[PDB]
Amino acid sequence: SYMLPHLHNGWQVDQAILSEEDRVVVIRFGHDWDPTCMKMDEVLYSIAEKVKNFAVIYLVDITEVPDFNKMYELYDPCTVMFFFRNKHIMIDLGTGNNNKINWAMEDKQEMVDIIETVYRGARKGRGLVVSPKDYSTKYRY
Amino acid sequence: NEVTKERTAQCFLRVDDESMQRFHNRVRQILMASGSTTFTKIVNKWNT
RNA sequence: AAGGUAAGUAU
């Protein structure tokens, strides 16, 4: 949660999105002190080395950097968004919101699969990718 | 009664609660491992 | 009330 790089103003976020031309820019919008953000950041930290070939992970504090709250509807405790070549890559998670991951995941392989799907779809030149797993339900039994 | 060839008692059978719980847990395990499982495999596990 | 947005390029 604290081992990941941080972006401290909107210009830094724009540059991080613009800098990467061959990798998915995974940016988590939230607060390091929020428990949901702590879970999501732990998951991202567990996979940060694995996906470094095709993904880069940044963390942004939405109070320190409020320049995207109105734009990206960052009014949730945690939010993960995907950008590839200065384009926001939407993902059809099945949750009704195709723009972001607004909850916290528990499986590293889940997040890695989502990142890989986003990377492949964005490389092919697509603005929306279909998630390998549906999230219309939590699969709790 | 074998010797007298006459009925003397009745065994009232009933499924043990432990086996009930075992079957319910088997169904729960089938349902949980169904994120990527196809419908045919889920129904086959149910049938089995 | 939702879990039912194709991603676009033009005009």
A15, containing H or E segment: helix A10-19
Report d(CA A80, CA A57) in Å as an integer.
Answer: 10
> Is residue A106 a part of any domain in this protein?
yes
Query: Across the interface, do B32 and A141 touch by the CB < 8 Å criterion?
Result: yes
> Is residue A14 a part of any domain in this protein?
yes
Report d(CA B24, CA B32) in Å as an integer.
Answer: 12
- What total number of domains does chain A contain? 1
- Resolution reached, in Å? 3.1
- A92 forms beta bridges with A130
At B26, list the tokens: 């088997």
What positions of strand C are covered by protein, i.e. any atom < 7 Å from a CB? 2-8
At A66, list the tokens: 């409020």
A55, containing H or E segment: strand A55-61
Experimental method: cryo-EM
Does A141 contact chain B (CB < 8 Å)? yes
Strands A6-7, A24-30: parallel, antiparallel or unpaired by DSSP? unpaired
Whichever domain contains A12, its CATH number is: 3.40.30.10
> Is residue A112 a part of any domain in this protein?
yes
Query: Across the interface, do A141 and B35 touch by the CB < 8 Å criterion?
Result: no
> Is residue A141 a part of any domain in this protein?
no
Report d(CA A141, CA A22) in Å as an integer.
Answer: 40
Contacts of A106 (CB under 8 A, 6+ apart): A39, A43
Range of the domain at A123: 2-136
The packing angle between helices A108-124 and A35-47, to 10°, is 70
Closest CA to A126 of A97, A81, A91: A91
Contacts of A121 (CB under 8 A, 6+ apart): A89, A128, A129
Closest CA to A109 of A61, A42, A47, A58: A47
Q: Whose structure tokens read 């059978």?
A: B13
